[PDB]
């Protein structure tokens, strides 16, 4: 039985880790029985809205329920986060930038 | 006039309806050149004009003549659109609804004249007929009986290739059956279609998402079919006595609900299906024992109840319903005596698995009375095992042989006097995996606990 | 998609949930009718049997 289990236990480890992590991260939103919708907020880059919509094209493709847009930008009074991109050739350079 | 509209959810055929609404057929020629009564088209033009800037229902009487005298393959479309549209809003007319429930002569033969030729004309004519039937004072069973006995509908309901026409045809039936008056009537020849519906359900549970088979079908564009099918069953099952036979007629389909409750996520099916089974298992009917045990045997839904109980649901209905299901599912058999049933099953020569077979919490005082005959019956069972070759039979006995020591400590001596230890050693290498695995379990626990 | 369409995903789903609950309630009324039927028939049977 060890021979058989070995093929799958390792995979299942990181698999189940993915589910626990995804459940946790989704759990940070607010929900109540009041509304069928889910109350959530998050912070999203602005130069990829079209890509976000296209990727949500799958949301309307197979699991479709016909509520495509979940994006509506409002304003706040707190400073936004700062972030940028990195590349393979610059693994070290970019790290020390924000270190 | 004021009534209850029908067929709102469907969308594909709304445009088909609109196809002729935006058009206009040539009525003048029909009666102008020896094909229609010279007044039919003249007053038909006036009626069409009345559709705007006016709002008084006696002039609708002659259309019976027109449809009776109707001769062209599609001229009937204008009048059937009239029928389907005068109901679109209460603003139309002043004396429509009252007259239908008065004279049955016209209404009865409306069905007779229609239901021929084109698919779409048949569909819309049936829609108009049933919609008129919706209103109070319209309960003539003969119309629905003749509708059922005809093969014209099944000639298209069998079209597994297209799901739209079959959708609408099945859909109108639920509104037809809202009242029990027609559930029984349909039950006579109901068999023509529920095999098809169960095929639809089997395909649904067979949903292969690795290939595109839901083309334009999602986004409320085809999910409605199951939402209304399950409603049809929850409707026809409002009667216990009639609900009994089907459960005693088809087995696999009913068991398929456990698979159904797993694949999809949409709420439109969960509460619907669970209620059907809840009705199926109530003592309110005078049969609630024939199929429950086999449901437990092949079902093994015990893991599922907690799984769905823990998960997320905003509705206030299914939460208690699943608790009812669980309490009636486990208490019925898992909370039962064993020794009597144990003897009954062993004497029959039939050995299988059951909650009694593996359950142990309810085995704290069975062993003492298993020694009443000095284990005569159980040792004879062991002998038949020695003269048996059924792997399940081999495993089940050894299971309780092990349960002996697991519960009862001093029965080791009788086990020793059995002399089957060498036969257990022989069973070690028998071909089946399960038999030798369970035999190793039994012999290992015997030897280790023998000192224990 | 289009920002002006964000009201359609609200109103259409409003209608969808409304019709779901409407069907649920219209069949709950049929359940009430069935309850009427049984609790009428049983009570009348029990009383009229003693009357007989």
From Swiss-Prot, chain A:
Q: Where in the cell is it found?
A: Vacuole membrane
So which domain of life are we looking at?
Answer: Eukaryota
Concerning PTM, the database record says:
Glycosylated.
**Record-stated family:** Belongs to the V-ATPase 116 kDa subunit family.
- What job does the chain carry out? Subunit of the V0 complex of vacuolar(H+)-ATPase (V-ATPase), a multisubunit enzyme composed of a peripheral complex (V1) that hydrolyzes ATP and a membrane integral complex (V0) that translocates protons. V-ATPase is responsible for acidifying and maintaining the pH of intracellular compartments. Is present only in vacuolar V-ATPase complexes; enzymes containing this subunit have a 4-fold higher ratio of proton transport to ATP hydrolysis than complexes containing the Golgi/endosomal isoform and undergo reversible dissociation of V1 and V0 in response to glucose depletion.
Subunit note:
V-ATPase is a heteromultimeric enzyme composed of a peripheral catalytic V1 complex (components A to H) attached to an integral membrane V0 proton pore complex (components: a, c, c', c'', d, e, f and VOA1).
Other noteworthy facts = Present with 55714 molecules/cell in log phase SD medium.
Stated name of the protein: V-type proton ATPase subunit a, vacuolar isoform
What organism does the UniProt record list as the source? Answer: Saccharomyces cerevisiae (strain ATCC 204508 / S288c) (Baker's yeast)
Swiss-Prot record, chain B:
Additional record remark: Present with 22500 molecules/cell in log phase SD medium.
For this protein, what is any one GO molecular function term? proton-transporting ATPase activity, rotational mechanism
Q: What is this protein called?
A: V-type proton ATPase subunit H
One GO cellular component term of this record is: proton-transporting V-type ATPase complex
Determine if Transport is one of this entry's keywords: yes
Function, as annotated, reads:
Subunit of the V1 complex of vacuolar(H+)-ATPase (V-ATPase), a multisubunit enzyme composed of a peripheral complex (V1) that hydrolyzes ATP and a membrane integral complex (V0) that translocates protons. V-ATPase is responsible for acidifying and maintaining the pH of intracellular compartments. This subunit is essential for activity, but not assembly, of the enzyme complex. This subunit is also required for silencing the ATPase activity of V-ATPase when V1 is detached from V0.
- The residue ranges crossing the membrane are none
Give from-to of the shown chain within the full protein: 1 to 359 of 478
UniProt subunit comment: V-ATPase is a heteromultimeric enzyme composed of a peripheral catalytic V1 complex (components A to H) attached to an integral membrane V0 proton pore complex (components: a, c, c', c'', d, e, f and VOA1). Interacts with YND1.
Arranged from A to Z, the UniProt key words for this protein are:
Hydrogen ion transport, Ion transport, Membrane, Transport, Vacuole
Topology versus the membrane:
Peripheral membrane protein
In a knockout, what does one observe?
Increases the ATPase activity of membrane-detached V-ATPase V1. Abolishes growth at pH 7.5 and in the presence of calcium chloride, abrogates growth at pH 5.0.
Q: What is the lineage of its organism?
A: Eukaryota, Fungi, Dikarya, Ascomycota, Saccharomycotina
Q: Which organism is it from?
A: Saccharomyces cerevisiae (strain ATCC 204508 / S288c) (Baker's yeast)
Where is the protein localized? Answer: Vacuole membrane
Keyword check for Transit peptide, yes or no. no
> One of this protein's GO BP terms?
vacuolar acidification
Curated annotation (Swiss-Prot), chain C:
Q: Which UniProt keywords apply?
A: Acetylation, Coiled coil, Hydrogen ion transport, Ion transport, Membrane, Transport, Vacuole
GO BP term, pick one: vacuolar acidification
Query: Which residues lie within the region annotated Interaction with VMA10?
Result: 12-31
Q: From what superkingdom does this record's organism come? A: Eukaryota
* Residue numbers spanned by region Interaction with VMA5: 1-13
Q: Name one GO cellular component term.
A: Golgi membrane
| Disulfide feature | none
Coiled-coil zones: 8-38
| Location, primary (coarse class) | membrane
Location of the protein in the cell? Vacuole membrane
Q: Tell whether Protein transport is among the UniProt keywords.
A: no
* Single GO MF annotation: proton-transporting ATPase activity, rotational mechanism
Has keyword Transport? Answer: yes
Subunit record text: Homodimer. V-ATPase is a heteromultimeric enzyme composed of a peripheral catalytic V1 complex (components A to H) attached to an integral membrane V0 proton pore complex (components: a, c, c', c'', d, e, f and VOA1). Interacts with VMA5; the interaction is direct. Interacts with VMA10; the interaction is direct. Interacts with RAV1 and RAV2 components of the RAVE complex, which are essential for the stability and assembly of V-ATPase.
Something else known = Present with 16134 molecules/cell in log phase SD medium.
State what this protein does.
Subunit of the V1 complex of vacuolar(H+)-ATPase (V-ATPase), a multisubunit enzyme composed of a peripheral complex (V1) that hydrolyzes ATP and a membrane integral complex (V0) that translocates protons. V-ATPase is responsible for acidifying and maintaining the pH of intracellular compartments.
Q: Which family does it belong to?
A: Belongs to the V-ATPase E subunit family.
Entry protein name: V-type proton ATPase subunit E
The protein's organism comes out as Saccharomyces cerevisiae (strain ATCC 204508 / S288c)
Gene designation:
VMA4
Q: Which residues of the full protein are shown?
A: 8 to 59 of 233
């Amino acid at each position: 039985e060890l021979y058989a289990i070995a093929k799958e236990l390792d995979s299942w480890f990181q698999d189940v880790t993915r589910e626990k992590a995804i459940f946790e991260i989704l759990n940070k939103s607010n929900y109540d029985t009041n509304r069928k919708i889910l109350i959530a907020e998050g912070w999203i880059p602005r130069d990829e809205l079209a890509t976000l919509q296209a990727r949500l094209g799958e949301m309307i493709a197979r699991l479709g329920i016909d509520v495509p847009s979940i994006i509506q930008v409002l304003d706040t009074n707190h400073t936004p986060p700062t972030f940028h991109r990195t590349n393979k050739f610059t693994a070290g350079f970019q790290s020390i930038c924000d270190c | 006039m004021g009534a209850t509209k029908i067929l709102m959810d469907s969308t594909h055929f709304n445009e088909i309806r609109s196809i002729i609404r935006s058009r206009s057929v040539a009525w003048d020629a029909l009666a102008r050149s020896e094909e229609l009564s010279e007044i039919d088209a003249s007053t038909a033009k006036a009626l069409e004009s009345i559709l705007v800037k006016k709002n008084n229902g006696k002039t609708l009487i002659p259309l019976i003549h027109l449809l009776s005298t109707s001769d062209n393959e599609d001229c009937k479309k204008s009048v059937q659109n009239l029928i389907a549209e005068l109901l679109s809003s209460d603003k139309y007319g002043d004396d429509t609804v009252k007259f239908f429930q008065e004279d049955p002569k016209q209404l009865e033969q409306l069905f007779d004249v229609s239901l021929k030729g084109d698919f779409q004309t048949v569909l819309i004519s049936g829609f108009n007929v049933v919609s008129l039937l919706v209103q109070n004072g319209l309960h003539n069973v003969k119309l629905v009986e003749k509708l059922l006995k005809n093969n014209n509908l099944i000639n298209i309901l069998q079209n597994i290739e297209q799901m739209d026409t079959c959708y609408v045809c099945i859909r109108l039936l639920q509104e037809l059956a809202v009242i029990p008056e027609y559930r029984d009537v349909i039950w006579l020849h109901e068999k023509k279609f529920m095999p098809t519906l169960f095929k639809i359900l089997q395909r649904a549970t067979d949903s292969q998402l690795a290939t595109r088979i839901v083309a334009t079908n999602s986004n409320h564009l085809g999910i409605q079919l199951q939402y209304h099918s399950l409603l049809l069953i929850w409707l026809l099952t409002f009667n216990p006595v009639f609900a009994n036979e089907l459960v005693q007629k088809y087995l696999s389909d009913f068991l398929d609900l456990l698979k159904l409750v797993k694949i999809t996520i949409k709420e439109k099916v969960s509460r619907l299906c669970i209620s059907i089974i809840l009705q199926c298992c109530s003592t309110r009917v005078k049969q609630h024992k024939k199929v429950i045990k086999q449901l437990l045997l092949l079902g093994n839904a015990l893991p599922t109840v907690q799984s769905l109980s823990e998960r997320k649901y905003s509705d206030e209905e299914l939460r208690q319903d699943i608790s009812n299901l669980k309490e009636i599912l486990e208490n019925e058999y898992q909370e039962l005596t064993s020794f009597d049933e144990y003897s009954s099953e062993l004497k029959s020569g039939r050995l299988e698995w059951s909650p009694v077979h593996k359950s142990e919490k309810f085995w704290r005082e069975n062993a003492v009375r298993l020694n009443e005959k000095n284990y005569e019956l159980l040792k004879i069972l062991t002998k038949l095992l020695e003269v048996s070759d059924d792997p399940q039979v081999l495993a089940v006995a050894a299971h309780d042989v092990g349960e002996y020591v697991r519960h009862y400590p001093r029965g080791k001596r009788v086990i020793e006097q059995l002399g089957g230890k060498q036969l257990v050693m022989n069973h070690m290498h028998h071909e089946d995996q399960q038999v030798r695995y369970n035999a190793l379990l039994a012999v290992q626990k015997l030897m280790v606990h023998n000192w224990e | 998609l289009t920002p002006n369409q964000v009201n359609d995903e609200l109103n259409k789903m409003q209608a969808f949930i409304r019709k779901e609950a409407e069907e649920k309630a219209k069949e709950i009324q049929l359940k009430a009718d069935q309850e009427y039927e049984i609790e009428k028939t049983n009570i009348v049977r029990n009383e009229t049997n003693n009357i007989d």
